[PDB]
Design an enzyme around this catalytic site. Structure first.
Site, PDB file in Angstrom:
ATOM      1  N   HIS A  46       0.840  -1.215   0.000  1.00  0.00           N
ATOM      2  CA  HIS A  46       0.000   0.000   0.000  1.00  0.00           C
ATOM      3  C   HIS A  46       0.870   1.259   0.000  1.00  0.00           C
ATOM      4  O   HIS A  46       0.397   2.324  -0.396  1.00  0.00           O
ATOM      5  CB  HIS A  46      -1.034   0.033   1.129  1.00  0.00           C
ATOM      6  CG  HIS A  46      -0.532   0.560   2.430  1.00  0.00           C
ATOM      7  ND1 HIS A  46      -0.361  -0.264   3.522  1.00  0.00           N
ATOM      8  CD2 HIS A  46      -0.172   1.804   2.827  1.00  0.00           C
ATOM      9  CE1 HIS A  46       0.074   0.443   4.543  1.00  0.00           C
ATOM     10  NE2 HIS A  46       0.197   1.719   4.140  1.00  0.00           N
ATOM     11  N   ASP A  97      -0.840  -7.283   1.744  1.00  0.00           N
ATOM     12  CA  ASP A  97      -0.181  -5.988   1.819  1.00  0.00           C
ATOM     13  C   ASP A  97       1.312  -6.231   2.029  1.00  0.00           C
ATOM     14  O   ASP A  97       1.837  -6.088   3.136  1.00  0.00           O
ATOM     15  CB  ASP A  97      -0.792  -5.103   2.899  1.00  0.00           C
ATOM     16  CG  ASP A  97      -0.348  -3.641   2.843  1.00  0.00           C
ATOM     17  OD1 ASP A  97       0.270  -3.237   1.833  1.00  0.00           O
ATOM     18  OD2 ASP A  97      -0.614  -2.900   3.832  1.00  0.00           O
ATOM     19  N   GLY A 196       2.801   6.234   8.907  1.00  0.00           N
ATOM     20  CA  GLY A 196       4.229   6.405   8.696  1.00  0.00           C
ATOM     21  C   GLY A 196       5.037   5.196   9.153  1.00  0.00           C
ATOM     22  O   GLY A 196       6.203   5.054   8.787  1.00  0.00           O
ATOM     23  N   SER A 198       3.970   2.141   8.439  1.00  0.00           N
ATOM     24  CA  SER A 198       3.624   1.096   7.455  1.00  0.00           C
ATOM     25  C   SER A 198       4.892   0.515   6.825  1.00  0.00           C
ATOM     26  O   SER A 198       5.854   1.249   6.557  1.00  0.00           O
ATOM     27  CB  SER A 198       2.687   1.654   6.409  1.00  0.00           C
ATOM     28  OG  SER A 198       1.432   1.958   7.000  1.00  0.00           O
TER      29      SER A 198
HETATM   30  N1  LIG Z   1      -3.222   1.239  14.579  1.00  0.00           N
HETATM   31  C1  LIG Z   1      -2.221   0.870  13.775  1.00  0.00           C
HETATM   32  N2  LIG Z   1      -1.322  -0.027  14.187  1.00  0.00           N
HETATM   33  C2  LIG Z   1      -2.027   1.512  12.541  1.00  0.00           C
HETATM   34  C3  LIG Z   1      -1.077   1.087  11.599  1.00  0.00           C
HETATM   35  C4  LIG Z   1      -0.893   1.770  10.395  1.00  0.00           C
HETATM   36  C5  LIG Z   1      -1.685   2.898  10.120  1.00  0.00           C
HETATM   37  C6  LIG Z   1      -1.537   3.614   8.943  1.00  0.00           C
HETATM   38  C7  LIG Z   1      -2.343   4.740   8.704  1.00  0.00           C
HETATM   39  O1  LIG Z   1      -2.222   5.459   7.547  1.00  0.00           O
HETATM   40  C8  LIG Z   1      -3.301   5.126   9.630  1.00  0.00           C
HETATM   41  C9  LIG Z   1      -3.444   4.426  10.821  1.00  0.00           C
HETATM   42  C10 LIG Z   1      -2.630   3.322  11.055  1.00  0.00           C
HETATM   43  C11 LIG Z   1      -2.793   2.629  12.238  1.00  0.00           C
END
Ligand SMILES: N=C(N)c1ccc2cc(O)ccc2c1
Length: 247
Positions: A46, A97, A196, A198
């Protein structure tokens, strides 16, 4: 990373910092990743899906800070950006993903292991720790959901694995989460991955070896009650990784 602690690359030396070159020449952070062999970094699809052109990306290894050089860092172009053909996104959940970046320096070389640059082991097939196990997550993502800025210093925290059964619950994620995903969370919901983070690693110690169990994928907000972090379940993607990491 919400909560947790600041760290340096020495404590997660497989961590890769991935940036994108803009039309105009500015460079901005995209996502985390993990070095799984000298020439291969693994991340999330993603992160790249909107801008799939490999020439647009720069990978740093050995980097502890977001917008400054770390002594001993190495810089890579992306020779191959492999996104998962079966990736899909619903309102929240991302499926399949997972992404591979083959890296090569301007001198045509792969990663050279150092004090600040090492690979991380993949799990064996379908071999995950039991639920309740403590694992670590690393990244440069937001420190608070409402933050604009990303932290300049790398961070890490600890979360616990949640059973597929518990994660399936209605006031968790219902049917949004699949067997190819892993949920993890803090029992107080006080610490988590966030925007961020990810593409970055969830690492657990398995049969006494530090193992890439997960890749930061998605969640409903960050460090929210009844809303665990959701991770690509790496031990369910080994055929795909095998089939894509050769000549
Ligand atoms: N709660 C998580 N671990 C988590 C992980 C990745 C995320 C990526 C985004 O863009 C927005 C929220 C997010 C929340």
């Amino acid at each position: 990373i919400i909560g947790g602690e600041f760290t340096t690359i020495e404590n997660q030396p497989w961590f890769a910092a991935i940036y994108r070159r803009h039309r105009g020449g500015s460079v901005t952070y995209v996502c985390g990743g993990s070095l799984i062999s000298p020439c291969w970094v693994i991340s999330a699809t993603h992160c790249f899906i909107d801008y799939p052109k490999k020439e647009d990306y720069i990978v740093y290894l050995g980097r502890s800070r977001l917008n400054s050089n770390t002594q001993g860092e190495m810089k890579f172009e992306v020779e191959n950006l492999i996104l998962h053909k079966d990736y899909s996104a619903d309102t929240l959940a991302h499926h399949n993903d997972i992404a591979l970046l083959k890296i090569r320096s301007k001198e045509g070389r792969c990663a050279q292991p150092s004090r600040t640059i090492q690979t991380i082991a993949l799990p064996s097939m379908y071999n995950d720790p039991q639920f309740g196990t403590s694992c670590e997550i690393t990244g440069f993502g937001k420190e608070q959901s409402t933050d604009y800025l990303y932290p300049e210093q790398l961070k890490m925290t600890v979360v616990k694995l949640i059973s597929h059964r518990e994660c399936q619950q209605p006031h968790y994620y219902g049917s949004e989460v699949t067997t190819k995903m892993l949920c993890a969370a803090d029992p107080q919901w006080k610490t988590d991955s966030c925007q961020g983070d990810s593409g970055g690693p969830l690492v657990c110690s398995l049969q006494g070896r530090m193992t890439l169990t997960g890749i930061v994928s998605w969640g409903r907000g960050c460090a929210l009650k009844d809303k665990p972090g959701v991770y690509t379940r790496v031990s369910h993607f080994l055929p795909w990784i095998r089939s894509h990491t050769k000549e």
